[PDB]
Design a protein around this ligand. Structure first.
Ligand SMILES: [K+]
Length: 263
């Protein structure tokens, strides 16, 4: 549909009848506008104390992330895990509560197009438990760019259990904003991403946040072909089948190729 879908080689799988059917993807974000004609929301939960409806997206972020998951894996069961309020901010407890729900509710893929500058024993415990429980955990690397020689990969992206996603444009160039470090795993399209917006709209957003869902959608396609495959196997296939770009500090393993990873 959008250029980023074709770029990751998703359409080849779609033509084959692999569209992410029976894959439960949790969008741990600002909610999802379930009212959008182009989105099918299966369930979810809100963990934002003042915004009790997960199906009301007061930000726009979670609907845009969800629509990218949907563009990659059209048949995937989308779950709106509302952890971020109208301002796009959320407390760590709300976020961790949303991961805890995703595990509890047998989500196959977690998408976290979110990041914080600091970790916690509780955040690491939550991601680790998800992984140990066979969930594919995908997160945005962060929008911190370059910072001397140091990692600018945010949390939870920083944790070895999480697939940390960096952003490339349509040319396969690293976006100037894309966080860097040894914890960067893969690259996906993350510059001027056309996706669904609340109130039957479409618009572009840029960020590693936009790159993350292409991988979460990519993990849904793999699981649709290979329902038997472990989260470990899904991850290894995505990482081992990449189009090799530059240095792993900047590009991770390179750009994901869903066609090559699906075998
Ligand atoms: K990581």
């Amino acid at each position: 549909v959008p250029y980023g879908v074709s770029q990751i080689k998703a359409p080849a799988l779609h033509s084959q009848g692999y569209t992410g059917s029976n894959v439960k993807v949790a969008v741990i974000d600002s909610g999802i506008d379930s009212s959008h004609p182009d989105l099918k929301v299966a369930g979810g939960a809100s963990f934002v104390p003042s915004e009790t409806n997960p199906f009301q997206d007061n930000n726009s972020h979670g609907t845009h992330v969800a629509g990218t998951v949907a563009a990659v894996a059209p048949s995937a069961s989308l779950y709106a895990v509302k952890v971020l309020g109208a301002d796009g901010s959320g407390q760590y407890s709300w976020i961790i509560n949303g991961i805890e729900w995703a595990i509890a509710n047998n989500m196959d893929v977690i998408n976290m197009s979110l990041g914080g500058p600091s970790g916690s024993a509780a955040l690491k415990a939550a991601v680790d438990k998800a992984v140990a429980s066979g969930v594919v955990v995908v997160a945005a690397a962060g929008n911190e760019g370059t910072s001397g020689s140091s990692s600018t990969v945010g949390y939870p992206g920083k944790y070895p259990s999480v697939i940390a996603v960096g952003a490339v444009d349509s040319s396969n160039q690293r976006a100037s904003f894309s966080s860097v470090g040894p914890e960067l795993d893969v690259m996906a399209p993350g510059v001027s991403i056309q996706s669904t917006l609340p109130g039957n709209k479409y618009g572009a957003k840029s960020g590693t946040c936009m790159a993350s869902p292409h991988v979460a959608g990519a993990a849904a396609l793999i699981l649709s072909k290979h329902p038997n495959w472990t989260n470990t196997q899904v991850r290894s296939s995505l990482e081992n089948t990449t189009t090799k770009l530059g240095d792993s500090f900047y590009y991770g393993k390179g750009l994901i190729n869903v066609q090559a990873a699906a075998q």
